[PDB]
Each structure stands twice: as structure tokens, then as C-alpha cells.
């Protein structure tokens, strides 16, 4: 197998990033040819080539990218990391068939920790008229991406009826935003009184509960 490491990575801007790829079997054939390549897939873009034959830089690729290693141990080194480099990096072998990719490595820009301002929105009258109730909790501009969100209805936590999504890392302040959406039937919505968005995050001094009263 190809085992890529780590699964996630965060780099303070202007520093160095070291991603590893390790093969169970040799990737060398003949003279001194290591058939392992490196790629980037930035958010919203197609994959692009960085390094090939373990150590060779592709055309139009910045000097900060380098490749090293042999046979089994392989390492991609990105130094002087900027906002441009954010995305997912993959290793790829070309020795045995079939040719496979690495499981990927999410490279992130590390900033000083920022707590999220947590917002809450009750279901609109327009939606309740349509027979469904959707409650929205919004966490804005936080770092890191890891945030834990729980939905409490009458202080009984909801499971299996919510789904959230995060924005890509903003290039300006290197922060994320999370939008969680709790969907309830109109019947179930009015059979309950209090609705809360319990949010936990590194930036928070203490777990934050943004709650509203139905009515």
C-alpha cells in the first residue's frame, strides 16, 4: 500500500511543511528511478503536478517545493508556505499495477486561535406556513476548523436530524465559518419550547450555548 502522513497538517505562514509517503514495496526500477509523484488539489481546482520521479520539479513550480527519499521512504517538503499552497496533497506511485494515489493530506494555514461568534436563527414564518421548521446556528470566523456542535431541544440533545457544512479557509484572515441546520416538522417544532445551539471550540473560554425561546 501507499500510506501518506499526516492526515491533516497546519503551517504557520513562512515556515516549512513536511509530508511523507511510505510504500510497502520498492518503487525503484532499473538504474535509479523512483516512480513516485506529488500533486496538489486546491479548493475548486483540478489536481496539478509538483514533483515526479521522487525529486524532479515540474515546469513552472516554485522553488519551495522539493522531493526526496528512495525505495520505501518518500518526503515532500514545502517551505516558505503561503496562502496559495492551501489544499489537499497526494502522493502517487507508478511501479506496480494498478497505479494508486495516497489517501491525501489536508494542508492548512495556521493562525493564532480565533473564537467564533455564535449566531442563532429561529424558523421563519414563511417556512412554518409551508409545514416545515428549520433552525440555523451560525459560527463565524474561527480557527481551527475543528468545532463540535450539538442541538438541544428542551435540553434533550438531537441526533440524526441535523447536517452542517464549513466554508473553505478564507485567504484574508485564515478562518472558517460553520453553518449547521436542524430540521424539524412543524408539529414537533411547536410541541417544544427552548431551542439551543451548544458550541464547543478551542477559542472559547467555556462552552457556548446560544439559545432562543419559541414564540
Amino acid at each position: 500500500v501507499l500510506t501518506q502522513s499526516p492526515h491533516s497538517l497546519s503551517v504557520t505562514p513562512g515556515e516549512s511543511a513536511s509530508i511523507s509517503c511510505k510504500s510497502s514495496h520498492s518503487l525503484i526500477h532499473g538504474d535509479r528511478n523512483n516512480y513516485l509523484a506529488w500533486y496538489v488539489q486546491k479548493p475548486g481546482r483540478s489536481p496539478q503536478l509538483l514533483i515526479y520521479l521522487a525529486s524532479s520539479r515540474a515546469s513552472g513550480v516554485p522553488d519551495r517545493f522539493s522531493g526526496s527519499g528512495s525505495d520505501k521512504d518518500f518526503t515532500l517538503k514545502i517551505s516558505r508556505v503561503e496562502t496559495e499552497d492551501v489544499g489537499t496533497y497526494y502522493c502517487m506511485q507508478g511501479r506496480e499495477s494498478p497505479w494508486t494515489f495516497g489517501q491525501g493530506t489536508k494542508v492548512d494555514i495556521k493562525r493564532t486561535v480565533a473564537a467564533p461568534s455564535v449566531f442563532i436563527f429561529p424558523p421563519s414564518d414563511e417556512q412554518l406556513k409551508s409545514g416545515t421548521a428549520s433552525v440555523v446556528c451560525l459560527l463565524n470566523n474561527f480557527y481551527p476548523r475543528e468545532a463540535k456542535v450539538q442541538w438541544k431541544v428542551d435540553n434533550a440533545l438531537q441526533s440524526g436530524n441535523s447536517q452542517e457544512s464549513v466554508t473553505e479557509q478564507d485567504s484574508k484572515d485564515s478562518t472558517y465559518s460553520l453553518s449547521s441546520t436542524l430540521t424539524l416538522s412543524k408539529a414537533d417544532y411547536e410541541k417544544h419550547k427552548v431551542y439551543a445551539c451548544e458550541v464547543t471550540h478551542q477559542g472559547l473560554s467555556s462552552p457556548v450555548t446560544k439559545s432562543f425561546n419559541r414564540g
Binding site: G30, N33, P47, F101, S124, T181
Partner: protein, 241 residues
């Protein structure tokens, strides 16, 4: 620099034909490759065609329902998915690449002539990629998006800044593009990716943080455009307390 066909939507059990190529007769000496990108699942190499044309290999996973080809007269390459399932909903990438071809075995006549020889191909790289083609597989039909307002209130206000937004709910299929004040409002806007609900319809939330000094002063209208249903929607978000 490779151009591929636009996004595709298929009912389950049907087939989709995806095209891709460089301009003109650009990369004839470069091998053809197909890579699959499932959002949040990783990268997947499907199969390849030698630029010489003596090879056409497909991975066991896709072997049953996938066909790769390339008619050299138009230079244009093709990928075919058949008997589509929901698990085939993914982004498909084409790629041109270089390789190494070194003889691994040889058998000779009793008088010296080469009877039989086998070559082995070693992938060097994939240098040229296409924009990507999104294929969506669902039993759902085209449905216009319902747009509901995320009203700013006492509860959605921190310090001197408040937050509002539109909630785009229950549509098919992607994509939906959301704007604020016809592009005039750019700062502080956060449009999240659509989430696939239990129904098979997508739901989307677009928010923007604004000072509470503006709630009476300024007007905040979201524009929600959805091409497949031929619908553009303008919704004004007001603070109702």
C-alpha cells in the same frame, strides 16, 4: 490545459458519456488517464490508454461499467459510465501523462531472432489536467429552490455586529449561485456548500455579517439563481422582532 464537457445529471440505471481534450493536435505523445474525485473521499485512478495505442487498462472496481476511448482523427478522448448507481456521483478528471517503457522479458529464436518480448509501463507523472466533469446520479427530478430569510434579531447580534442571510432549501440539482444586493454587497459574505438532505434535495445557507447600525439604514436583498428550474429569486431579509 485540457477542456472537458459540462456537468451531467443522470437518473439511476442510465449511462453518461464524458468527453475531454487538449487544443488541436497538442499532446498526442502523452498517455490518456482518468482520475475520479469523490468530494471528501480522496483521489482515484480509474484507467489509462497508451499514446502508442497498444494498451487500454481498467481497474477492477470500474471494470464492469466503465469504458475509455480516444479516436485519433479528432484527437478527442471519451469516458463512458454505464448502469449508473448513486455511488457513481463523483467528479471525473482526465489527464495527459508521460511514462517509461522498458523491456522486462525476451525470448529468442534458436538462430538469434526475437520470438517474444514483453514491455512494462511505469507511470512517470500526470502533467496536464482537465477542468473536471461533475456527474450526479439521483432519482430526483428538477425542483426549484424555496428561499427563506434568516432574520437578524437580538439573538443574532454580538457587540455592534449582526448577521442575516438567505436559506435555500429543497432543490434539484446543483448548482445554485447566491448573491447579495446584486454584487454590491461583497464584504463579510459567507456562502456555504449545499448539503444533500434525506429527501434527495439540496439545502443551502448564505450569510453575511453586518453592523447593527445598518439594519434600519440599509436594505439586504439576496439573489438566488437556479438555472435548471429557470428560476432567479430575489428575497429581502428584514429584522422582524
Amino acid at each position: 490545459q485540457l477542456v472537458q464537457s459540462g456537468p451531467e445529471v443522470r437518473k439511476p440505471g442510465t449511462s453518461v458519456k464524458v468527453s475531454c481534450k487538449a487544443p488541436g493536435n497538442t499532446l498526442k505523445t502523452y498517455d490518456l488517464h482518468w482520475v475520479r474525485s469523490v468530494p471528501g473521499q480522496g483521489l482515484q485512478w480509474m484507467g489509462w490508454i497508451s499514446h502508442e495505442g497498444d494498451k487500454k487498462v481498467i481497474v477492477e472496481r470500474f471494470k464492469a461499467k466503465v469504458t475509455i476511448d480516444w479516436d485519433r482523427s479528432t484527437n478527442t478522448a471519451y469516458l463512458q459510465l454505464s448502469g449508473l448507481t448513486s455511488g457513481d456521483t463523483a467528479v471525473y478528471y482526465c489527464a495527459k501523462g508521460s511514462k517509461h517503457r522498458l523491456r522486462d522479458y525476451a525470448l529468442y529464436d534458436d538462430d538469434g531472432a526475437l520470438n517474444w518480448a514483453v514491455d512494462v509501463d511505469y507511470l512517470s507523472n500526470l502533467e496536464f489536467w482537465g477542468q473536471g466533469t461533475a456527474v450526479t446520479v439521483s432519482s430526483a427530478s428538477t425542483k426549484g429552490p424555496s428561499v427563506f430569510p434568516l432574520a437578524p434579531s437580538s439573538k443574532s447580534t454580538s457587540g455592534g455586529t449582526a448577521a442575516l442571510g438567505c436559506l435555500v432549501k429543497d432543490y434539484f440539482p446543483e448548482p445554485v449561485t447566491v448573491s447579495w444586493n446584486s454584487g454590491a454587497l461583497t464584504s463579510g459574505v459567507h456562502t456555504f456548500p449545499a448539503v444533500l438532505q434525506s429527501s434527495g434535495l439540496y439545502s443551502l445557507s448564505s450569510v453575511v455579517t453586518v453592523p447593527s447600525s445598518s439594519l434600519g439604514t440599509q436594505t439586504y436583498i439576496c439573489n438566488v439563481n437556479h438555472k435548471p428550474s429557470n428560476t432567479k429569486v430575489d428575497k429581502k431579509v428584514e429584522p422582524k422582532s
